[PDB]
Amino acid sequence: AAGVIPVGDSRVYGAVFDKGRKLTVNQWQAVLSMDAYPENGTTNYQEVGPWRYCEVDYEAAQGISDYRGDTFGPVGVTTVGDFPDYFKKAFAPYVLGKSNATNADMLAWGVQVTGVTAGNFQADDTALDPYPSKSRSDKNKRAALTKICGALQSAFDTQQDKYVMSHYAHIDQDKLVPVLNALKGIGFTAFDRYNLVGLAFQVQVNTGSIGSISAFSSVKSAGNCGSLSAETCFATYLTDQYIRWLKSSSLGDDPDNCWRASMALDIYKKDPTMGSVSVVNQVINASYPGNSGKCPTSGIKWSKNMSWQ
C-alpha cells in the first residue's frame, strides 16, 4: 500500500524538517530508511503502521519496569517524556493550528479528550499523565491513556499529512537539531561528502544523549586518531561508544541490538555520503539479515569514553 509522505515532499524537507538543508533529500532517504530497519524490520520508513502506532503502556506489556505512558509514532514519543515538546512545538501548530501552545493548553487538551478533570493530571515540561498516583494498571487510568491514543490516531485518520508533518517536525527539533549542535561543537558542519549526521542520528533517536559526543574533542586533541581523518576517526569512535552503550547492562542494556551500530558504520565505509538507500539495503541484506548480526569494535584505544545522559 501507499506510505506516508516522504521526506522529499515539498511540505517536509526544507520546510518542517532540516530547515537549513544540511543533508540532501537522497541522504535523508538513506538515513531514515536505515534507521527504520532495527526499529521496524524494514527499510521502508514510510510504512503507515509505525506512523499511526499508539500503544498504552508498552513497557508494562513487555515486562519493563519504567513507566512512560503512551508510546506513539515513528520515533516513539512518550507521554511521560518528550510529549510536552511534541505537543507544544509540533502537534499544536501543525494539527491544531495553535501557536504559542503552553503546558496549560496541553492540560486543556488532555481534559478535552479524556474527560478526566484538570486536577487529576500531571501536566508540565516532563509529562502529560492522567491519574499520576494511580496504579499503572488502574482501569480508569488505562481508559484515559486509551483516549489519548484515540485522539492521536484520530489526527492520523482525519489529517494524515498534517499529523505526519508534526512527527517530522518533532524529529527535526528533538533529534536533528541536537545532532547538528553537537556535531558543530566538535568541528563538523558540512555533510555533503562525510555524512556524520547519518551515524549520529541513530544514536540520538536511540539514546537521546548525542550531546555526549563532546568527549571526542579530548580524543582528537590527545592524538588518538593518528593517520585516520577527523571524520573517519569520529565515525569509528562514535560506533565504538554506541556499541559499548548497547552491550552494557549498566548503560543501554540492549545487547541483542548492538549490531545496529556496526550496520551504520559499514554503510558509512561503503558510502561516506550515506546518500543511497540502495547501499543501505545492500549492507543490511549482506551482513544484518533477520535483524541481527555481530557488533565488533575497532580495538582503538580512546583516551576518553562518552558519559551518557
Cα–Cα distances in angstroms (integers) from residue 112 to residues 68, 92, 292, in the given order: 21, 14, 44
Locate 278 and state its grid cell.
540502495
Identify the experimental approach: X-ray
Residue with cell 549482506: 286
Same domain as 72, residue 59: yes
Same domain as 279, residue 143: no
Other Cβ atoms within 10 Å of 273 Cβ, number: 18
Query: What string of DSSP letters covers 182-214?
Result: HHHHTT----SSS-THHHHHHHHHHHS-GGGGG
Count of domains forming the chain? 2
Same domain as 236, residue 165: no
Amino acid sitting at position 88: K
Same domain as 213, residue 244: yes
Domain boundary among the residues 135, 158, 175 is at 175
Beta-strand pair 77-78/127-130: unpaired
Task: Note down the domain range covering 276.
Answer: 18-44+176-309
Same domain as 167, residue 56: yes
Same domain as 202, residue 291: yes
Cα–Cα distances in angstroms (integers) from residue 136 to residues 62, 119, 151, 222, 290, in the given order: 14, 18, 20, 49, 34
Contact 178, 171 (CB under 8 A): no
Same domain as 285, residue 209: yes
Same domain as 62, residue 113: yes
Whole-angstrom distance, CA of residue 52 vs CA of residue 154: 9
Domain boundary among the residues 141, 175, 209 is at 175
Residue with cell 502537534: 91
Locate 220 and state its grid cell.
582528537
Same domain as 122, residue 85: yes
Q: What resolution in angstroms does the PDB record give?
A: 1.8
Whole-angstrom distance, CA of residue 59 vs CA of residue 267: 31
Contact 72, 53 (CB under 8 A): yes
Same domain as 122, residue 180: no
Tell me the helix, strand and coil percentages in the chain, rounded to 5.
55, 5, 40
| Element holding 72 (H helix, E strand) | strand 70-72
Long-range contacts of 123-126 (CB under 8 A, 24+ apart): 124/84, 125/84, 126/80, 126/81, 126/84
Amino acid sitting at position 308: W
Amino acid sitting at position 85: D
Same domain as 4, residue 149: yes
Same domain as 67, residue 30: no
